[PDB]
């Protein structure tokens, strides 16, 4: 609640391996480039892959890695917070040490460390937490339990597991809507190019009582830009996919429809995936 | 103590990254044991992100222990509801996922097993018991089976992708951490070949550096997807095809394996050197 005062705090949730981090970074870059917003990304994926395209290839040191190797007194803002494309601030929480420790404890510690270092600037326009939603356990769903960000967006695709993951995240949102003021702002579709995928999403959003903030199409220029360790925005701000991310970024920034979702049961979800084939 | 469970059986945990066919291999290995060697086999799913028993139950989704426990109560959880019988009498149980925002996925697996034990759901005459465990992130939760001694004999499924080998190394780190405390050991690496290529040599060296061995090289074969499309294992779909014999060989090797080690996980440099020498 006391982090980045006049900034839109947003958490981007979603299953892994569906391009969630690519959409988060390109959305962040779209805001800074097209609308001149001061943006900050705090990664919360154990892979620590939420800022590589903003910092250009170099995998940034994670907060939990630095803290493990050094300790509280040694950590500095210069080491864990990096500036990248369009002066976007980048921080990575990092994953747990194999065999011990919870993902959520790592993200709490990283946010706390950023708090103590005064690393979230007061003039921030947009702060994004990129969080993994394969499993809504106490660790990965801690942001929902504590309202780390009140405005949630779920990334999904026209795939069974990706819809399953999305629905279970909506359950976590519904669960903590009153306790932490958490809300669902909408759904982001990273297209898999499935026949009737846009209709599948429209319906999925209607059942959840939410909306599709944007349909992000599949485009080869994405893999092109990432091969250059770049966002599509920086690689070519004029290409159609860049405008697609711009519309996404603008819809998020302008969104005011923050709802308590109505997750579907497993039976309705079975019907929906059986009916879109 | 968990050494109570299935005392006459070879108790085995299978860890691995998702999206690499770990559950496919576990179920086909189980199907081979029961089909070819008349083994009494049981699978306990410990992957909340992966179906570990669908191929044995012909596509019939199974009520998970944790779902029945949370939404119905302790009384409701009964062997009939959570323990199912499929191909060649292979017993099936699914731990389930966590309560959103509170439950620990790894602790729930331990709760699932504990409940199964209280319901005498692990037959004494079991020949082989399989825990199909998620190995995407080696957090304390999913390292519980290793620190609790659910199975002292661990197997790691990987493939030729960096992230699969990376995840495999991290699992080896989790085994080593509790190897002294829990007696947990690594019995071998299972490679689900992504393609018909030189993956075997890459795996032979990977195992060498980890201080372990390749218990089998599961070739890539489209018959897996055709069998999955029919909601079956390859064993049930076509027990005479070569891929069925590959699982047969893997099943036999796991069953009689007595070469267990404390792994030597690779350094980050070693992993990069292996990647360079064999291609990105
Ligand atoms: S709550 Fe989740 S991230 Fe934390 S230890 Fe348990 S399974 Fe792992």
Judge whether B18 and B52 are in contact, CB under 8 Å: no
Judge whether A127 and A120 are in contact, CB under 8 Å: yes
Residue B121 is assigned to a ligand binding site: no
Q: What is the DSSP string of chain B?
A: -GGGSSTTSEEEEEEE-SSSSHHHHHHHHHHHHHHHH---EEEEEE-TTS-SSTTTTTT-----HHHHHHHH-TTT--HHHH-EE-GGG-EEEE---PPTTT--HHHHHHHHHHHHHHTT-S-TT-SEEEEEE--SS--TGGGHHHHTTS-SEEEEEE-SSHHHHHHHHHHHHHHHHHHHHH--EEEEEEEE-SSSSTHHHHHHHHHHHHT--EEEEE---THHHHHHHTTS-HHHH-TTSHHHHHHHHHHHHHHH----B---PPPHHHHHHHHHHH--
Residue A119 is assigned to a ligand binding site: no
Beta pairing partners, B153: B12, B185
Q: Which of B94, B129, B152, B115 is nearest to B8 (CA)?
A: B129
Q: Other C-beta atoms within 10 Å of B125: how many? A: 8
Experimental method, per PDB record:
X-ray
Provide, as residue numbers in chain B, all residues whose Cβ is less than 8 Å from the Cβ of A93: none
Q: Name the residue among A98, A100, A175 with its Cβ closest to that of B100.
A: A175
- B49 catalytic residue (yes or no): yes
Give me the catalytic one of B17, B39, B40, B88.
B17
A266: burial class by Cβ within 10 Å (0-12, 13-18, 19+)?
A: exposed
Residue B106 is assigned to a ligand binding site: no
Q: What count of residues does chain B have?
A: 280
Q: Which of residues 191-220 of A touch B (CB under 8 A)?
A: none
Domains of chain B: 8-278 (3.40.50.300)
Judge whether B197 and B59 are in contact, CB under 8 Å: no
- The packing angle between helices B105-118 and B65-72, to 10°, is 80
- Which residues are CB-neighbours of A68 under 8 A, at least 6 positions away? A97
Q: Which of B100, B154, B175, B181 should one mutate to test binding to chain A, selecting the residue with the greatest count of A CBs within 10 A?
A: B100
Judge whether A155 and A188 are in contact, CB under 8 Å: yes
- Which residues are CB-neighbours of B56 under 8 A, at least 6 positions away? B27, B30, B31, B43, B86, B87, B90, B92, B233
Q: Which of residues 115-174 of B touch A (CB under 8 A)?
A: 136-141, 143, 146-147, 170-171, 173-174
Element holding A40 (H helix, E strand): strand A39-44
Judge whether B56 and B102 are in contact, CB under 8 Å: no
Annotated catalytic residues of A are 15, 20, 47, 134
Resolution, given in Å to one decimal, reads: 2.3
**B185-192: strand order across its sheet:** B84-85, B91-94, B41-46, B128-133, B10-16, B153-158, B185-192, B214-218
Judge whether B220 and B195 are in contact, CB under 8 Å: yes
SS3 state of residue A16: coil
CA–CA separation, A82 vs B217, rounded Å? 43
What secondary structure letter does DSSP report for A85? G
Tokens coding B170: 């991290």
Pocket of ligand 1 (CB under 6 A): A 102-104, 137-140; B 104-106, 139-142
Beta pairing partners, B191: B158, B217
Q: Other C-beta atoms within 10 Å of B245: how many? A: 14
What secondary structure letter does DSSP report for A125? S
Say which residue the tokens 């480039």 belong to.
A33
Judge whether B14 and B130 are in contact, CB under 8 Å: yes
Contact (CB<8Å) A96/B137: yes
Q: What is the DSSP string of A180-243?
A: S--EEEEEEEE----TTHHHHHHHHHHHTT--EEEEE---HHHHHHHHTT--HHHH-TTSHHHH
∠ CA A247-A252-A254, nearest 5°, is: 95
- The packing angle between helices A20-34 and A240-254, to 10°, is 80
Q: Is B109 on the interface with A (CB under 8 A)?
A: no
SS3 state of residue A267: helix
Distance from CA of B100 to the nearest CA of A (A): 5
Q: What are the b/e assignments for B114-124, b being 16+ CB within 10 Å?
A: ebbeebebbee
């Amino acid at each position: 609640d006391e982090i980045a005062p006049d900034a839109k705090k947003v958490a981007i949730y979603g299953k892994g391996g569906i391009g969630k981090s690519t959409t988060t970074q390109n959305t962040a870059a779209a805001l800074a480039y097209f609308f001149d917003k001061k943006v900050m990304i705090h990664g919360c994926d154990p892979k620590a892959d939420s800022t590589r395209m903003i910092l250009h290839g170099k995998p940034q040191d994670t907060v939990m890695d630095v803290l493990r190797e050094e300790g509280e007194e040694a950590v500095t803002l210069e080491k864990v917070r990096k500036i990248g494309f369009k002066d976007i601030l980048c921080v990575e929480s990092g994953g747990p040490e194999p065999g011990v420790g919870c993902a959520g404890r790592g993200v709490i510690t990283a946010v706390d460390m950023m708090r103590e270092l005064e690393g979230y600037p007061d003039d921030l326009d947009n702060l994004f937490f990129d969080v993994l939603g394969d499993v809504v356990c106490g660790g990965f769903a801690m942001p929902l339990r504590d309202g780390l960000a009140q405005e949630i967006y779920i990334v999904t695709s026209g795939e069974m597991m990706a819809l399953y993951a999305a629905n279970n995240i909506a359950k976590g949102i519904l669960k903590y809507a009153e306790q932490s003021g958490v809300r669902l702002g909408g759904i982001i579709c990273n297209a898999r190019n499935v026949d009737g995928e846009k209709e599948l999403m429209d319906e999925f959003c209607d059942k959840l009582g939410t909306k599709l903030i944007h349909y992000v199409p599949r485009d080869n220029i994405v893999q092109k830009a990432e091969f250059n360790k770049m966002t599509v925005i920086e690689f070519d701000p004029e290409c159609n996919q860049a405008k697609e991310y711009r519309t996404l970024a603008k819809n998020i920034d302008e969104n005011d429809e923050l709802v308590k979702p109505t997750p579907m049961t497993m039976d309705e979800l079975e019907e929906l995936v059986v009916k879109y084939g």
